[PDB]
């Protein structure tokens, strides 16, 4: 009913997680807590180590022709369950497994990045590119014997966020261009409606242009794009659109000029980029657009992994444009965290 | 929220009929339409749905390859094309929703439009 | 997967606790919702996940899971509580409703 499973080989190395999405605070993270029934009369001298890994598998659609392991660690924690407070699930599953029932729970610390998969190109292969988290446990008699995928069981966890109870001012900025004559030439303000969007949400801009020299504009173009924000070995910005809308409107040379855009981001029309930040994938499966990464006051220190954010831009092609930033995120389930059973395509 | 539907009908075998549907009060891409069958007498039965965040397209065994369902963003409303009608097909059918990403069930129903289908 | 419903019509009356169950062929986790119709209106959402109420439902029904079964308990019946009750399984593409439960005024 309520915990996941699942099992390797004749270990009887049954993992038990309560949940597999840990929900993340700005600074708290859900603790990994969980049971891992063993059979000791197999392990014998054995000792059952469950590890939690983050792990960073960078551009491997590139090196093909190298195919090897291009992957760095970003986090790892070892716990020795088979030689910390036992949470209610874990003292539920102790009670039903029994003797042979030996939990395990780490703390992931603050500011790790987000599950966030890049999207494959055309010709998709091998596990993922981005971040994941994952547990494993397996039987050895010490964590650097050389492990053979016979008695370990591997779960795949996401580290997820969700948008923020308050939301904060509407983005809100403006830029002011003049040339030749300069009298008194275009400002272009800009505000949306609101800064945390949900998944499926439209983005409603609001913008105002007072084109009062010779020359006009011509169209009025609107986009929001993915900012990821990439660092492993160096860092790195990339800007990819998720939705973008083109508008023919004409400002004439007067003083004011009205309108407002609405557009809205989905994954249908943006397969085709390659290095798209999606949502950490839990199997080989679909997830949405990645959500806003939400960072904490202290630093938006170089952290690695991919840290994603989004702003609307809006450009005046005489060109003038300015950058609305906000928040895509799912609001918080107030339910149980994962996808809750997309129907599946049997 | 509301689901106000049209294009319910009498239609003879072979023929085609459209049933149209405009949704009001959720996005397109934030929600995923139904169509539900219930022939008189008899229980509910799923026919088609579609996601338009994903933009996937399932039909039923029994209307695989036969109906089409389709939804139109900019006007806010969601289309299931009806081809090669049989008399079978008679049922009202009601067209629901379910949040795009967190399925949580069906949670709002349209009033359904009577289909019969008879020489 | 098929979806039935034990109990093909059953009586009650007002006040009387009405536990409704169904069975699948086979384990469908919690993704398991049940609906209320009246006669000539659209089904209502009563339960999601097999355990969850939906907003706006009384708080007399109530939803629970055995394994494949899944049971849907009325509690304290009410007048507004004689209609026809249908299963669903949403876990795979091929949704499967049940073949439905009608709650029957009992003299």
């Known amino acids: 009913t309520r915990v996941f499973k699942k099992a390797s080989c004749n270990g009887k190395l049954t993992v038990y997680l309560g949940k597999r999405d840990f929900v993340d605070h700005i600074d708290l993270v859900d603790p990994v807590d969980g049971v891992v029934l063993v059979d000791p009369e197999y392990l014998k001298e054995r000792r059952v180590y469950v590890t939690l890994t983050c792990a960073f598998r960078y551009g491997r659609e590139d090196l093909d022709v190298l195919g090897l392991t291009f992957r760095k660690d970003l986090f790892c924690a070892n716990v020795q369950s088979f030689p910390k407070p036992l949470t209610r699930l874990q003292e539920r599953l102790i009670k039903k497994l029994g003797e042979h029932a030996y939990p395990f729970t780490f703390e992931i610390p603050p500011n790790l990045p987000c599950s966030v998969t890049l999207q494959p190109g055309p010709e998709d292969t091998g596990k993922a590119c981005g971040v994941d988290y994952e547990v494993k446990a397996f039987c050895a008699e010490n964590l650097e014997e050389k492990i053979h995928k016979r008695n370990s069981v591997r779960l795949v966890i996401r580290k997820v966020q969700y948008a923020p109870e308050r939301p904060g001012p509407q983005p809100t900025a403006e830029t002011t261009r003049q040339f030749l004559m300069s009298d008194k030439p275009l400002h272009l303000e800009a505000s949306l409606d609101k800064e945390i969007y949900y998944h499926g949400e439209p983005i409603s801009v609001n913008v105002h242009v007072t084109n009062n020299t010779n020359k006009t504009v011509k169209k009025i173009k609107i986009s929001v794009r993915q900012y990821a924000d990439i660092c492993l070995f160096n860092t790195a910005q990339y800007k990819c659109p998720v939705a973008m809308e083109e508008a023919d409107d004409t400002v004439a040379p007067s003083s004011t000029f009205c309108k407002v855009y609405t557009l809205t981001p989905f994954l249908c029309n943006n397969r085709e980029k390659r290095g798209l930040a999606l949502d950490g994938k839990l199997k080989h499966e679909d997830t949405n657009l990645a959500s806003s990464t939400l960072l904490r006051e202290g630093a938006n220190r170089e952290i690695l992994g991919i840290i994603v954010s989004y702003k609307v831009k809006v450009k005046l092609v005489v060109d003038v444009a300015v950058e609305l930033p906000f928040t895509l995120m799912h609001p918080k389930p107030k339910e149980e965290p994962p996808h809750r059973e997309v129907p599946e395509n049997e | 929220v509301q689901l106000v539907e049209s294009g319910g009908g009498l239609v003879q075998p072979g023929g085609s009929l459209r049933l149209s549907c405009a949704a009001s009060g959720f996005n397109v891409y934030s929600s995923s339409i139904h169509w539900v069958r219930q022939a008189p007498g008899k229980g509910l039965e799923w026919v088609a749905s579609?996601?338009?965040?994903?933009?996937?397209?399932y039909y039923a065994d029994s209307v695989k390859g036969r109906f089409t369902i389709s939804a139109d963003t900019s006007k806010n409303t969601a289309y299931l094309q009806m081809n090669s009608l049989r008399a079978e097909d008679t049922a009202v059918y009601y067209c629901a929703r379910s949040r795009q990403f967190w399925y949580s069930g069906l949670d709002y129903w349209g009033q359904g439009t009577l289909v019969t289908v008879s020489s | 997967i098929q979806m039935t419903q034990s109990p093909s019509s059953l009586s009650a009356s007002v006040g009387d606790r009405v536990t409704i169950t169904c069975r699948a062929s086979?384990?469908?986790?919690?993704?398991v919702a049940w609906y209320q119709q009246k006669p000539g209106k659209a089904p209502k959402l009563l339960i999601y996940?097999?355990?969850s109420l939906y907003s706006g439902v009384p708080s007399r029904f109530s939803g629970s899971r055995s394994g494949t079964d899944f049971t849907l308990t009325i509690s304290s019946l009410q007048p507004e509580d004689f209609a026809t009750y249908y299963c669903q399984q949403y876990k795979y593409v091929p949704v499967t409703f049940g073949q439905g439960t009608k709650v029957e005024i009992k003299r």
């Open positions: 996940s097999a355990s």
């Open positions: 579609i996601s338009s965040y994903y933009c996937y397209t």
């Open positions: 086979q384990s469908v986790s919690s993704a």
